Amino acid sequence: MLKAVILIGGPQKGTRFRPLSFEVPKPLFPVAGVPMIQHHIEACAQVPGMQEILLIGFYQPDEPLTQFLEAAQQEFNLPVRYLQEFAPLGTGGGLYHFRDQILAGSPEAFFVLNADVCSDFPLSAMLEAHRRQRHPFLLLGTTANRTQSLNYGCIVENPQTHEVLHYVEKPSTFISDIINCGIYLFSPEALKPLRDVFQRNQQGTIRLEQDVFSALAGQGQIYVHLTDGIWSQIKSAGSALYASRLYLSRYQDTHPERLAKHTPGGPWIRGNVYIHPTAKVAPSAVLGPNVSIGKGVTVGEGVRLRESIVLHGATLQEHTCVLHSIVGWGSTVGRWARVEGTPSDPNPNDPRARMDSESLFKDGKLLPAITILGCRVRIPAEVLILNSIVLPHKELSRSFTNQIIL
Amino acid sequence: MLKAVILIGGPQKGTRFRPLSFEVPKPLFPVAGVPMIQHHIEACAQVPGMQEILLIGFYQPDEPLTQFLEAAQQEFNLPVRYLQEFAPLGTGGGLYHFRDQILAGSPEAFFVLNADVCSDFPLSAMLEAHRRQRHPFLLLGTTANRTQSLNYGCIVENPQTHEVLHYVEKPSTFISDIINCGIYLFSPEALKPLRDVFQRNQQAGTIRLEQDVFSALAGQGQIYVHLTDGIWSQIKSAGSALYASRLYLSRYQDTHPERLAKHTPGGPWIRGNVYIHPTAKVAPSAVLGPNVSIGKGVTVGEGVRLRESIVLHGATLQEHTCVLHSIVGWGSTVGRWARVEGTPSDPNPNDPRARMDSESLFKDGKLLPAITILGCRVRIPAEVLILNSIVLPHKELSRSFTNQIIL
Amino acid sequence: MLKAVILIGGPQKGTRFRPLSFEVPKPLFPVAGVPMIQHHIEACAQVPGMQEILLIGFYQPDEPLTQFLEAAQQEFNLPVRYLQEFAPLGTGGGLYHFRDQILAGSPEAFFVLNADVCSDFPLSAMLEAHRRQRHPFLLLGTTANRTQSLNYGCIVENPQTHEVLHYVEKPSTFISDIINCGIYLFSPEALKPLRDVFQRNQQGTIRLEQDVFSALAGQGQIYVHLTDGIWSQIKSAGSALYASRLYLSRYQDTHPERLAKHTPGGPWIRGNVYIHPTAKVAPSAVLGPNVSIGKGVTVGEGVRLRESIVLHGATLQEHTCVLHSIVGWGSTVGRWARVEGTPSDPNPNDPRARMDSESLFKDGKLLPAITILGCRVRIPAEVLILNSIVLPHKELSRSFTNQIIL
Amino acid sequence: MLKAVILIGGPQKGTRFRPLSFEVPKPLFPVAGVPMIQHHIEACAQVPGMQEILLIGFYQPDEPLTQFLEAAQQEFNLPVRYLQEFAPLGTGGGLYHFRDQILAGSPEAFFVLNADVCSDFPLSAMLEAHRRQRHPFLLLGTTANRTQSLNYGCIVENPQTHEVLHYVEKPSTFISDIINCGIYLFSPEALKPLRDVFQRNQQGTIRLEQDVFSALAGQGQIYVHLTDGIWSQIKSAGSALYASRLYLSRYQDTHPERLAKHTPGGPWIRGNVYIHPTAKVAPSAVLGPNVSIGKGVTVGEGVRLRESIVLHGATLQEHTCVLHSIVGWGSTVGRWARVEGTPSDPNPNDPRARMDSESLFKDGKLLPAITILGCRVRIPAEVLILNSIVLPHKELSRSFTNQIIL
Ligand SMILES: Nc1nc2c(ncn2[C@@H]2O[C@H](COP(=O)(O)OP(=O)(O)O[C@H]3O[C@H](CO)[C@@H](O)[C@H](O)[C@@H]3O)[C@@H](O)[C@H]2O)c(=O)[nH]1
Ligand SMILES: Nc1nc2c(ncn2[C@@H]2O[C@H](COP(=O)(O)OP(=O)(O)O[C@H]3O[C@H](CO)[C@@H](O)[C@H](O)[C@@H]3O)[C@@H](O)[C@H]2O)c(=O)[nH]1
Ligand SMILES: Nc1nc2c(ncn2[C@@H]2O[C@H](COP(=O)(O)OP(=O)(O)OP(=O)(O)O)[C@@H](O)[C@H]2O)c(=O)[nH]1
Ligand SMILES: Nc1nc2c(ncn2[C@@H]2O[C@H](COP(=O)(O)OP(=O)(O)OP(=O)(O)O)[C@@H](O)[C@H]2O)c(=O)[nH]1
């Protein structure tokens, strides 16, 4: 038997995902219709031998997290527990702090997944490689562009034994095309270096990449497993859109009943579109590629929706165009209003993609990105929101362009 | 018997041109050490015969609002009540909706005061002009620059009798250089035209006071002006509040000489006018430049240079930091050798009586360089420059930011 | 042109409904399936000429109240406005304070409705009796039992013209057997006495019963309209149970699709039972008379449910017996656990009924009434909760009998 | 070098016997004027060598507990740290789970204190007994009656070497007069038997008294240090009033500036009375024995206060008699109002006897005990509140006797 540890963050790691995170926690943001960690729990309960799923984070258990945990426990036939760490303990410090609960029942190995990644999660093939080799650390790696790889944790390996010889968390200079994916397979022996790291701290917070992956690289403990299935990070509020698009593309294999079909008496559907059943979509509303509709969403007639997330309880009145946007919970977009953004994906194989920095401005100018509307934002009739971020509970009366509307 | 009505706004109507804060209500923001409406309440409770003080707004009753009401009631031994509207009723709709509460006790007159002004508040001078005149609407007006007069309520008066003949609220072309200060003396008959505006609509109860009652009743012998020479500013932006802080710390030299910070050469070096709370800990090596206001429980380390800044309560500035032109929010930490700097929004010093322009956070799609705002519980790391940035509340930074809005 | 003023209270009004008012406000408590005031709103929106519904209370407008407001505005196609008062102004002082908002549009008349009452709401009959004579106050009245009438507002009338000669709010002896129903029809002239009352307090708070009805009774202003329909007050937390019984009896005539039908496929039912469509009920559940089931309720195989109210998200495991109880939101009753109460209907006509005090204890013993479980109370297996009150978020381990579990 | 673990509870633990106060946590309740665990932190920081104080519990960190931690760190010049358990873990499971934080820095011994005890805390005496023999467990023992000891953990000791030969936690018939006090002194080897318990549950929650003390008794690890200082459990509200009395008696010998002297320009003061400096007490108020006033309390002219606690912000108007009560914070008692409770104190006929904790309900009947007025409870003028429990945010309007007013 095995178990999974999904490292969800806490409220400080959700600061970068801020317009969206004001209402829900970041790991519960619905990416292609289901919350962000439900893709992880989906992929982990698909593995034969999964006993437990242990979320580690420093979120307080509010109503949405505990209701999600009970819903995941019923839907996925597993005990899904939430281990709240007493302090922000870094990446590996919460795995070392909870080692008695992780190793309870003596699992053969355990997965360690970052909650902010979108992946196909090739957990079975990682397990095949681990049961072949039996090493302390198995990392998942992807190939990136040489220019984009500097935004990520670079891995220099040995292409015959697949041993990580070098690891650097964000190098200024080129190191390697292999980037860490935030998916790991630890054996129980892997909790013995972390102990050492913690003991060296006494002369509690352990960063897994800077203190364990970069230290034991080349000593025989850390190994790679490569893929090139889908992979994305979700850091800012608008990388949720790229993650949603990748997931809606892989629903063509894993859940094709989530994807909506045209059915000539209904709304006109291009590309991959998720529509929740509670949503009412008018038959003249064409829903373009990579759209996901939340529950309780009333989409009026003639509404064009392309490359967007419309969250729960939102309302798009007649003849609206919503492109590359995230319409928040309960937001209302009046008739002939245009909410337009600019596509900006992380995409580590795109040589023109931005670094996904925390600074949204270059020199006073807001860089063109996804248009985020917070919850309860009333966009008036006949008005354009272009490349803007609107903070929650803001009733607007005016056209806004390249602005953060506080 | 006189009473006072302070029109405080509400959660959406604040519309912060560049935010002073995010989590405390805008009337309770400390300008020159004390909350923005406590200057109004001091000025009103100094007036003899003033019985009651009413705050009309549509803020929900949170805890800071209630504890400020109790603190003001205890400090001035006046009733200070908060009449909350069922909706945003505009500038005159809350006066018409609460006219039985306003006119209970039968006052001789009532002062209507905008919450977001910094004023000398010559309430006895307006009171004496009105006791000589006995007119329905008396307005305090100042003198504006010709270019900047278009942002305020402009007044064509008659200079012999001091009667408003024409009123435009926010013009596009110049009509006058007299501007409405936002301070009014109302007779108990001034509620009688407000009713008329309501009955023009009912043929709910929103009445813009300046656009419906002042713009349309001018020239009819009903509105009169009282021209003043003292300090006056509008407090809308963050730089507008730093300017109001400078004006009020100037006026503290002859109203509250105990409130300013003297040198005390065992203690911190004081340049200019500085307010320090008695509970704040300021290390003796820290030099505190002009127009600095320190809240309660603020810890200031050694060698801290504070110049033209508001440091709200609970904030900790560690050693060797430089905070200039900033509003360090409550509970915010600035670590060693960090520099939190903003750009001053100073009036045009070549021109007579330029008041202030309030920056609108974006000029033409570009972010404007202005005051640096740190939100509540913002952590600035050691050895980091924050320049012209707004850091949203509860955000631990890790690098130097320049001309950002860090969410 | 008519409108309706529904006097919902505030939190101090709803403290008498304490186990259940921790979660939702009292007017939004679901009685026979829908919230308490949606009965009033639906019964006003069938009056020809009804143009506005105003809710006057001192509840702060949090998320559930404005969700209810928008949902009713869409469901009944009427403007449902909420008028929050600056201070708790009594029963009539909030009508006097909001007079310009009520008298807007020059309405012919307006119905004042207390939120706590359960009624058939005979609004058209009061309307016709008003249009025949046009008096300042029309009161709705019922005949009570001579013993029970001392607990209510008694109206001494003249039996010919039906004009009030006397009003006493809580009598000491028998004054009359006609009691005040909390349903009123006001002409626009009715605010001319209220103003007088307000001025008499200056040389704000106005009790409509004690300051307006007690004074103008016998002076030719107040008239009565006797009715025979179902009438109840919902003061205590378990008078909602008797109200839901009366409303589920009215549902046979007014909304017959809300009741459940005996079918081979699902559970078998005796008497009037409301089951929500999103509620999963097992076929071996026997849902006895006067039972309301909320959305998301799982009712296990073998559950006996009789004279109860189950609320949204609650779980009853197999073989449980729930009788005369109210099961709060998300509560869990484990298997073979029995949640029993004693019927305690307010019942003015009945001569046996309790006086409905705010006490609940007689001589140190909790008087036997409805067993209320609060929000998310977890009840273990094989345990008895008999005549008890469990405050919310309690995980019991024991049998409890005639207690309050704090 | 030593440190001190105080085992504060969590929200489910410690609310059952009676409610001292509904809103602030049980460890933050002011017993004799200062919070309940400030007596522990006082006694612990007064011990030479004490480097840290840890608070192990499962309360979520809110502004009361965080603000108290800041205040205590500032006052006592120690680091005072709250360690939140991820789950309720028992009285030994939190000690074992946070063993890397407790044993960090090499303490030579650490105290473990139950948060709900009144004691003089002879920590230097226990430390002198431990520095002379260096055993894994040192327990504080008191003597109890031969019918009260069934309610405590009983210790059969050796009269000469003071070694526990038997431990029983809640016996059914009489075992020993020596009872466990909830004050322990652990050596760093004492976290080695705890690990031995933990693995034996593998085939996290560790009870200290039932798994560690009761099963290692007689092997050479658990010893006793007998005393006869002040001692009490603080479980119910009568327990809190009595522990306030014991601490106010000890304030004569330790903090004599806390007790209130006469000051003939002030109130009349009988017995031991703590008054906060920020409180406002009229000169005509007679403050009887064992009263403690919180901060910002206005006390009117002619108030009688006897055997009572008045929390921060409460106003008692003129001529009120508050006897044997806890007036919660922000409460208001009107003119000529009586708030009375009945004390079921220690036996007058037995020297040995402790305080029995009543359990809110005995023999199906609500017991006459301390009157608890909750937070912002408004008691009207000329109203008697006898033996009642008024739940928070309640305005009453009449007299009540032997109730729980919801
Ligand atoms: N009760 C209530 N108060 C309000 C509302 N809206 C604004 N207020 C408060 O009423 C005052 C009026 O502000 P604004 O309506 O936003 O206009 P303004 O830009 O401040 O202009 C007014 O004051 C200027 C002086 O600074 C004048 O120049 C101008 O003529 C006008 O009087 C402010 O204190 C505002 O907070 C409302 O809907 N209800
Ligand atoms: N961290 C943590 N602390 C806890 C937990 N459970 C209880 N505590 C704290 O541990 C202390 C006592 O534990 P209890 O087990 O609830 O106490 P008791 O049954 O009433 O009796 C205890 O004290 C008596 C003397 O006061 C003793 O006789 C007895 O042996 C035991 O220590 C209290 O401060 C309680 O808040 C827990 O799960 N986790
Ligand atoms: N449980 C838990 N998870 C965390 C914590 N910190 C980070 N994580 C998770 O692990 C991922 C790592 O994020 P970061 O802490 O930013 O580290 P990084 O991805 O290597 O990038 P850098 O910021 O350059 O260090 C986060 O996206 C979270 O999913 C933590 O303190 N506790
Ligand atoms: N808006 C508003 N509504 C109120 C206020 N007080 C009561 N109400 C509502 O109006 C109705 C009258 O309340 P009650 O005074 O309790 O009715 P009652 O039957 O005369 O009195 P009791 O049953 O003895 O408590 C109730 O439905 C309340 O919800 C108030 O101050 N403001």
XYZ file of C-alpha atoms and ligand atoms in Angstrom, chain A residues 7-10 13 26 56-58 85 87-91 94 114-116 169-170 209-210 233 235, ligand 3:
57
model
C 1.123 19.977 -0.004
C -1.521 22.651 -0.092
C -0.262 26.014 0.927
C -1.689 28.539 3.284
C 0.947 31.235 -0.777
C -6.412 28.794 -3.798
C -0.642 19.309 4.558
C -1.065 23.058 4.830
C -1.452 25.985 7.177
C 0.764 22.512 10.474
C 3.475 27.203 11.493
C 4.474 27.757 7.877
C 7.110 25.053 7.790
C 8.259 25.241 4.212
C 7.933 22.448 1.715
C 5.712 19.824 6.981
C 2.440 20.328 -4.975
C -1.137 21.578 -5.062
C -0.337 24.377 -7.511
C 16.025 26.295 -7.913
C 16.060 29.298 -10.274
C 14.378 22.031 -3.203
C 16.995 24.297 -1.641
C 2.007 25.693 -12.670
C 0.710 30.756 -9.424
N 2.073 22.481 3.384
C 2.825 23.448 2.904
N 2.955 23.506 1.605
C 3.714 24.477 1.104
C 4.339 25.392 1.937
N 5.032 26.264 1.177
C 4.847 25.909 -0.096
N 4.028 24.813 -0.166
C 3.595 24.113 -1.394
O 4.720 23.737 -2.169
C 4.807 24.582 -3.336
C 6.160 25.273 -3.396
O 5.937 26.679 -3.481
P 7.105 27.670 -3.007
O 7.186 27.723 -1.402
O 6.827 29.026 -3.528
O 8.485 27.094 -3.587
P 9.075 26.972 -5.080
O 7.958 26.459 -5.903
O 10.293 25.928 -5.104
O 9.547 28.426 -5.586
P 10.327 29.594 -4.812
O 9.316 30.627 -4.272
O 11.373 30.322 -5.806
O 11.068 28.972 -3.692
C 3.715 25.654 -3.200
O 3.160 25.973 -4.472
C 2.691 24.964 -2.285
O 1.886 24.125 -3.101
C 4.153 25.267 3.320
O 4.697 26.059 4.063
N 3.386 24.283 3.824
